[PDB]
């Protein structure tokens, strides 16, 4: 729960962010879920974790959506000659 | 008892009152006809109100224009403003409205300073 407090500290940026997301990924896929639920006081920080990672999810979704202009430039450069 | 109409026009300080009524063509500035306007080089500046639309829209009317005040070129701008807006007022309220806003579209397509004047003074930067 100390490392989770550090992860919640790290999560609210855009540079220190993928590090926090892969830390919480490794914890979440290598621990027990009932353990992570009944660790005392470990909902009062994941409720602060989830909207920041939702905002980052929509931001990286919008960036990977914007990345298709290279596909458009490719089909136009194919249509050129 | 004749159908008369009266309009006003003014650049800087000159003032031009125009009485348009049903006549037979004559156009007067202080009694003197429109061919004799004083500064002699802006006579086409005073002609072009009655030259954008054709003289056949002036065959039925006659215009007497008193003009006081202002300098030479301000007076002749006042006469062209009074002639133009007097013609469009006479056609507004004595012949057809389609001819009225056709005249108004022609004048505001040439330049709208023929009809209304930018009479609001300066910018304090």
């Amino acid at each position: 729960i100390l490392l989770m407090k550090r992860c919640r500290d790290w999560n609210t940026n855009a540079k220190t962010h993928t590090i926090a997301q892969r830390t919480i990924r490794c914890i979440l896929m290598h621990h027990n879920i009932a353990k992570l639920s009944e660790i005392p006081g470990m909902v009062k920080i994941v409720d602060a974790i989830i909207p920041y990672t939702q905002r980052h999810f929509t931001r990286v979704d919008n960036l990977v959506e914007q990345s298709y202009i290279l596909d458009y430039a490719l089909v136009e450069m194919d249509k050129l000659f | 008892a004749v159908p008369s109409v009266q309009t006003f026009g003014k650049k800087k300080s000159a003032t031009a009152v125009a009485h348009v009524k049903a006549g037979k063509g004559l156009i007067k500035v202080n009694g003197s006809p429109i061919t004799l306007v004083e500064p002699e080089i802006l006579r086409f500046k005073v002609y072009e109100p009655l030259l954008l639309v054709g003289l056949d829209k002036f065959s039925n009317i006659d215009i007497r224009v008193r003009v006081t005040g202002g300098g030479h070129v301000s007076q002749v701008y006042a006469i062209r403003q009074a002639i133009a807006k007097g013609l469009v007022a006479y056609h507004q309220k004595y012949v057809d409205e389609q001819s009225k806003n056709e005249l108004k579209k022609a004048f505001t397509s040439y330049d709208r300073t023929l009809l209304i004047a930018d009479s609001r003074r300066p910018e304090p930067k």
Partner: protein, 791 residues
């Protein structure tokens, strides 16, 4: 192109009269104001009927086949409408006051509460043609002493219960051959009896009173006739019974009292099933479904409507209009929702694909003035007369800035630049144009310049110049960015209202007080033309006049203007009941719509042989829907268009026939078939050839499409893909189209603007929602398999 039918009516969801369900529970129809509206409660949509009574409307129903409605006004002007095609059918006049009408359950006959009497008529038919005199009066009955307050029909078509304000509730037979069965007169209640209902087995008759008595009449012994076997009491303190109904097939009695409360009972044991309250103002009418599930309520003071599913105690719709207020509107620049702003002082956010107020915004104290969106339509603004303007978003639905002057001054209009940074507002009694930064909610500058009060503002969209306009006969072009603050005045002849700006940012249209419209270029300052519009609006002769009906300059001007997003058509409305729409390059009226025919509204008609007054305060075009909204005294008015019944083709000739298109399709020349159908421009042919093009040549047809049908194809694919179902086929078509012809629309940006709004709000309304739902399903699967919790 200007075939603007009157389609919807947002706002004022119920005004006066009795809400009725359809023959099934699918269509709830309500007596809004003058017209009626129909809400489709399963395929969730709404429309409003095109007819119009001459006064306010008083009683509605449709018969049990669902194929024939009759509405009837406050005086006796019966409108009969063939319901399943929205055509007005017959125009009868009953001779006196109507109270309530009711179709018989078979559909042959209907019954009418004509004051103290009772009318019994047989209906005309809808399969045969238009008659001339189709109403045959069957029988009148004249047994009461005072006016009838309601009717109920039996399950079969044999008996009606007429409950009246005189304390009798009388049972009357429909035909005189069996009249000796029951013509009896149940007395007994203390004050007025306001309902009388049969049971399922028609041996028990309930009668419900004003004070709250329920009497159960039964045919028992002491030949032997109609005693009262059971009495129930409601025991509201000082809340008399205001409306009732009783669905017999499930034994459900819904009673709404006169204090916003309603209770509802399982009647033969009289147990209180469910009791709640709507407001501090009386519920006026109730109605049930045919099958007992849905149960709708209409409160008439505030004008709100409930529907209720009471098995699982939950609602389907819950709307509320206003009481005689709609002061402005705004669309969203992705045309999916519309803000109205109401003179009571509150904002509503309707959505045009539904008909529901999905959001109120109750914040302002005093009246509101105008609303204006910015930045693709997820940030809006609202200016009040209270003394402030304020921001809102349409994601969290909350304020975040309250911009105010430091002086407690009201406002009249406002606008906001597209780069969502600055917000301008224009007041009435300090002659200025205030601007606030929307990043930090401070007052940027008191941008002065006029000599009088300003009345209408707009920012541009290409250079973001300001174009103020004020009652010193002057419009004022401002450039407020970049070290300059450049001012440029333009001087109009008469006083000035009602500015709007063309969406390409090259010219500005302004109304005048001398009944005219002008258009001005703004990189220049010369005019382009003035549409004269003081001969083609018909204001109404007031009932408070000495003068005539035409010469009096009452509302011979245009209080609000808007451009269209192609750039040519201008719609304009004023304080009179005439909506005009023009075009700019030919200066002529495309069309003129009268807005209403309510003689309850004072200045409505021209030859009438204080009051509510007809008025139109804000009109806007849709960014995509090819409709325009007016904000009248009634509510929001939606005139929509279509590619339907008007046959307006595009350079056809002798060989292009729909038969020729379909044979070219079956001979598989798909591009030739598509251009052969788009030259024809007909709805079913376009839809048929567009669906029947298969998938392996969408690159071929989207590459070899011509360069002149492309905005029409984009507009059609968007306006079919919103309410289509084939979302992968639509997405394949759009991918092929704006991959093959992407640079051309970018070099011809402006004439594709009313299409590229559509296929972008096709994506961000349904397709991105479906895609993030399947995204969440993939991530929940990946979690529920990748982790391991065995407690």
């Amino acid at each position: 192109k200007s075939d603007f039918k009157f389609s919807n009516l947002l706002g004022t969801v119920y005004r006066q009269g009795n809400i009725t369900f359809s023959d099934d529970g699918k269509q709830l129809l309500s007596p809004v104001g003058n017209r009626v509206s129909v809400f489709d409660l399963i395929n969730n949509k709404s429309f409003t009927f095109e007819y119009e009574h001459r006064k306010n409307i008083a009683a509605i129903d449709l018969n049990k086949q669902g194929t024939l409605l009759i509405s009837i006004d406050e005086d006796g002007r019966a409108i009969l409408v063939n319901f399943k095609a929205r055509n007005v059918l017959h125009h009868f006049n009953f001779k006196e006051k109507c109270s309530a009408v009711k179709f018989s359950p078979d559909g042959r006959l209907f019954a009418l509460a004509s004051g103290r009497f009772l009318q019994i008529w047989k209906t005309p038919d809808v399969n045969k043609d238009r008659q001339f005199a189709p109403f045959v009066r069957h029988r009148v009955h004249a047994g009461h002493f005072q006016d009838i307050t309601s009717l109920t029909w039996s399950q079969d078509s044999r008996f009606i219960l007429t409950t009246s304000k005189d304390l009798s509730a009388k049972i009357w037979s429909v035909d005189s051959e069996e009249k000796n069965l029951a013509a009896t007169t149940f007395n007994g209640h203390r004050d007025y009896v306001m309902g009388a209902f049969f049971s399922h087995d028609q041996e028990k008759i309930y009668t419900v009173s004003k004070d709250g008595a329920v009497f159960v009449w039964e045919f028992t012994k002491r030949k032997y006739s109609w005693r009262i076997t059971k009495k129930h009491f409601f025991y509201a303190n000082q809340a008399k019974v205001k409306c009732v109904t009783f669905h017999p097939a499930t034994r459900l009695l819904a009673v709404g009292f006169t204090s916003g409360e309603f209770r509802l009972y399982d009647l033969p044991d009289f147990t209180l099933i469910q009791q709640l309250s709507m407001g501090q103002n009386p519920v006026n009418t109730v109605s049930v479904n045919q099958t007992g599930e849905w149960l709708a309520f209409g409160s008439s003071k505030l004008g709100q409507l409930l529907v209720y599913e009471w098995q699982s105690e939950s609602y389907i719709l819950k709307q509320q209009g206003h009481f005689d207020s709609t002061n402005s509107l705004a669309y969203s620049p992705d045309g999916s929702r519309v803000v109205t702003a109401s003179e009571d002082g509150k904002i509503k956010v309707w959505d045009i694909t539904s008909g529901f107020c999905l959001a109120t915004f109750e914040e302002h104290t005093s009246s509101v003035t105008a609303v204006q969106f910015a930045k693709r339509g997820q940030v809006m603004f609202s200016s009040s007369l209270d003394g402030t303007v304020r921001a809102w978003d349409l994601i969290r639905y909350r304020n975040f800035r309250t911009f105010t002057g430091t002086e407690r001054i009201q406002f009249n209009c406002l606008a906001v630049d597209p780069s969502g940074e600055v917000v301008c507002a224009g007041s009435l009694d300090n002659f200025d144009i205030h601007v606030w930064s929307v990043q930090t909610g401070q007052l940027l500058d008191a941008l002065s310049g006029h000599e009088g009060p300003v009345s209408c503002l707009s920012f541009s969209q290409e250079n973001s110049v300001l174009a103020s306009a004020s009652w010193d006969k002057t419009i004022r072009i401002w450039s407020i960015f970049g070290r300059s603050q450049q001012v440029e005045p333009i001087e109009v002849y008469s006083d000035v209202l009602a500015l709007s700006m063309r969406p390409d940012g090259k010219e500005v249209a302004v109304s005048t007080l001398k009944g005219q419209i002008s258009i001005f270029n703004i990189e220049d300052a010369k005019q382009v033309g003035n549409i004269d519009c003081r001969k083609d609006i018909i204001s109404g002769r007031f009932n408070q006049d000495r003068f005539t009906a035409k010469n009096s300059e009452r509302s011979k001007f245009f209080t609000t203007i808007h451009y269209s997003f192609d750039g040519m058509a201008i719609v304009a409305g004023g304080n009179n009941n005439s909506i005009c729409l023009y075009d700019v390059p030919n200066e002529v009226l495309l069309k003129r719509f009268i807005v209403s025919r309510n003689m309850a509204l004072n200045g409505t008609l021209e030859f009438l042989n204080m009051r509510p007054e007809v008025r139109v305060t804000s009109v806007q075009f849709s960014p995509t829907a090819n409709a325009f909204a007016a904000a009248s005294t009634e509510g929001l008015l939606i005139y929509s268009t279509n590619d339907t019944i008007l046959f307006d083709p595009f350079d056809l000739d002798v060989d292009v026939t729909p038969h020729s298109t379909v044979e070219a399709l079956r001979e598989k020349q798909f591009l030739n078939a598509l251009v052969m159908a788009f030259r024809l421009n007909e709805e079913y042919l376009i839809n048929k050839v567009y669906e029947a093009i298969p998938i392996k040549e969408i690159p071929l047809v989207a590459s070899n499409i011509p360069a002149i049908y492309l905005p029409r194809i984009l507009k059609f694919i968007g306006d079919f893909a919103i309410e289509s179902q084939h979302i992968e086929f639509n997405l394949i078509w759009i991918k092929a189209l704006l991959s093959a012809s992407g640079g051309y629309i970018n070099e011809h940006k402006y004439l594709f603007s009313t299409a590229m709004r559509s296929i972008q709000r096709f994506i961000v309304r349904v397709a991105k929602e479906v895609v993030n739902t399947t995204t969440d399903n993939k991530y929940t699967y990946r979690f529920l398999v990748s982790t391991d919790g065995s407690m």
